[PDB]
């Protein structure tokens, strides 16, 4: 029932390994903010508005995937008006781009040379992952090499 | 109805996963049921956003 | 404005029908204008002025071809707009006779000699 | 490929399918020059 | 202020000029729609996309005429 549906919302979004009084106190805040609101254009169009903002930043087939999935999702409309508010807030290969040597019915458009320099940034991203990792190994120990006895260690606290 | 509501839940899982929402399968089904009751979505948007800040200060 | 809803404003301008009365034309427009919204061409209000002259000469009104030349002076006299190319190239695109060939007439660079 | 076309355009007894064939080898020199233009712009690389 | 109201004056003039340019080339769009097209052209936009939309929405009322 509905007095449990906010509490189960409270449990799943709380991880684990006080925090045993906090669940029961946070369902109180869940009801206390339910009735702050209650005292005081279709649904699919907002999804079309976010897919447009995908298309401006590139990634066309992804926006086409969003819309082919919401055309069958018309068969829930009160869920999407909530979904669009949590689509901006987050947590706190293919070979057919530049290949014509496959198929038999394969396009002729010749060269590109307008994002083939951004086909080398495709490799710059991969090397920039594996160089940011070696930057996150040298700092987590350089914070250790300069330290003092028992300032972060509670073993001196015994 | 039941096969069609299974299919519409699956499609609803996919479009919230590529949009990279912090929610999961279970909390999607909870929120879907809460909106299926007739509860105002504008109020649920507050409790999810304030929970997802307030639960981290505990850990 | 925000560019996503600004299209729907145009769609509700031409036909006054609601955005819940039709959703396929509106979807067709989010299909067409997105991935063709940011320019991939090099801008020139110069070249477009030199064909706006060629359009109004083709309608054989030479004084109005000199009236546009003054209106274009006013446009620079204020300086409240950044992209003065786009709207004139737009109004040129929607040209119509009130009363051939074009590939041998000047068009801009499609960024096949410049890439970032 | 350019040296061949340099003399065929002085030639006239090469039909008019040959002068359609060799005429559809002008675009194919052009696109090379387009590639080289893109490379020249980004030179100021390795 | 006053100088911030004079900017809007230099926009209201500029729009009158754009309306004159619109009428001497003869579009079927009026001032109200044209202002929305000016909003669009402020962000920078290609008419190879826009003209098709205008000649389509004028073609979507021939069966509702």
Q: In this complex, which chains have at least 3 CB pairs below 8 Å with chain C?
A: A, D, E
Residue A149 exposed, middle or buried by CB count within 10 Å (0-12, 13-18, 19+): exposed
Using the Cβ of C40 and the Cβ atoms of chain D, whether some distance falls under 8 Å is answered with: no
The technique is cryo-EM
- B28 touches B12 (CB < 8 A): yes
Give the separation between CA A103 and CA A83, rounded to whole angstroms: 41
- A67 touches A48 (CB < 8 A): yes
Q: How far apart are the CA of A96 and the nearest CA of chain B, in angstroms?
A: 22
CA angle, B42 then B47 then B53, to 5°: 130
**Residues of E whose CB is below 8 A from C22:** 60
With touching defined as 3+ CB pairs under 8 A, do chains A and C touch? yes
CB within 8 Å: C19 and A67: no
Q: In this complex, which chains have at least 3 CB pairs below 8 Å with chain E?
A: C
Using the Cβ of B25 and the Cβ atoms of chain A, whether some distance falls under 8 Å is answered with: no
**Chain D: residue whose CA lies nearest to A112:** D35
Give the separation between CA C36 and CA C56, rounded to whole angstroms: 28
Which residue has tokens 């009104």?
C61
What is the interface size between A and C, counted as CB pairs within 8 Å? 49
Record the tokens describing residue E15, joined without a space.
Answer: 């729009």
Give the separation between CA B17 and CA B4, rounded to whole angstroms: 20
End-to-end CA distance of chain A: give it in Å, rounded.
49
Rg (CA), chain C: 18
Using the Cβ of C93 and the Cβ atoms of chain A, whether some distance falls under 8 Å is answered with: no
Contacts of E29 (CB under 8 A, 6+ apart): C94, E22, E37, E54
DSSP-derived secondary structure letter, C41: S
Using the Cβ of A109 and the Cβ atoms of chain C, whether some distance falls under 8 Å is answered with: no
CB-CB: which of C19, C112, C115 is closest to A45?
A: C19
Q: Distance of CA A76 to CAs B12, B15, B37, Å?
A: 8, 13, 11
Closest CA to A111 of D44, E49, D27: D27
**Chain C: residue whose CA lies nearest to A51:** C30
CB within 8 Å: C112 and D42: no
**Chain C: residue whose CA lies nearest to E15:** C75
Sign of the C-alpha dihedral computed for residues B43, B19, A62 and A58 taken in this order: positive
**Residues of C whose CB is below 8 A from E56:** 25, 28
The three-state secondary structure class of C71 is helix
CB within 8 Å: A110 and D38: no
End-to-end CA distance of chain B: give it in Å, rounded.
42
From the DSSP assignment, how many helices (H) and strands (E) are in chain E? Answer: 3, 0
Reported resolution in A? 8.1
**Residues of A whose CB is below 8 A from B43:** 33-34, 37-38
Residue A152 exposed, middle or buried by CB count within 10 Å (0-12, 13-18, 19+): exposed
Closest CA to B23 of A92, A8, A86: A86
Sign of the C-alpha dihedral computed for residues C72, C76, C79 and C81 taken in this order: positive
């Amino acid at each position: 029932s509905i007095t449990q549906l906010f509490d189960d919302l409270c449990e799943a979004l709380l991880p684990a390994a006080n925090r045993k009084r906090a669940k029961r106190s946070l369902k109180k805040v869940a009801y206390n903010a339910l009735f702050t609101n209650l005292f005081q254009l279709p649904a699919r169009n907002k999804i079309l508005m976010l897919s447009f903002d995908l298309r401006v930043g590139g990634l066309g087939p992804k926006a086409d995937r969003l819309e082919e999935l919401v055309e069958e999702l018309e068969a829930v409309g009160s869920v999407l008006d909530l979904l669009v508010q949590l689509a901006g807030s987050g947590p706190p290969r293919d070979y057919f781009l530049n290949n014509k040597h496959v198929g038999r019915n394969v396009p002729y458009s010749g060269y590109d040379c307008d994002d083939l320099s951004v086909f080398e940034m495709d490799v710059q991203s991969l090397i920039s992952r594996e160089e940011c990792l070696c930057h996150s190994m040298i700092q987590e120990t350089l914070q250790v090499m300069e330290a003092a006895p028992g300032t972060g260690l509670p073993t001196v606290g015994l | 109805n039941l096969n069609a509501v299974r299919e519409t839940m699956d499609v609803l899982l996919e479009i919230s996963r590529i949009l990279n929402t912090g929610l999961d399968m279970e909390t999607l089904s909870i929120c879907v049921r809460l909106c299926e009751q007739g509860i105002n979505p504008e109020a649920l948007s507050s409790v999810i956003k304030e929970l997802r800040k307030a639960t981290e200060a505990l850990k | 404005k925000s560019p996503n809803v600004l299209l729907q404003n145009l769609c509700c301008r031409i036909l006054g029908r609601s955005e819940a009365d039709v959703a396929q034309q509106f979807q067709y427009a989010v299909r067409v204008i997105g991935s063709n919204f940011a320019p991939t061409v090099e801008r020139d209000e110069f070249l477009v002025a030199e064909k706006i002259k060629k359009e109004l000469i083709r309608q054989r009104r030479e004084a109005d071809a000199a009236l546009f030349s003054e209106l274009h002076r006013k446009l620079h006299s204020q300086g409240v707009l950044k992209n003065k190319w786009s709207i004139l190239y737009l109004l040129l695109s929607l040209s119509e006779d009130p009363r051939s060939y074009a590939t041998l007439f000047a068009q801009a660079l499609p960024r096949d000699a410049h890439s970032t | 490929i350019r040296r061949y076309t340099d003399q065929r355009s002085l030639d006239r007894s090469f039909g008019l399918v040959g002068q359609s064939f060799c005429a559809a080898l002008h675009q194919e020199l052009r696109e090379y020059y387009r590639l080289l233009s893109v490379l020249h712009s980004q030179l100021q690389l390795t």
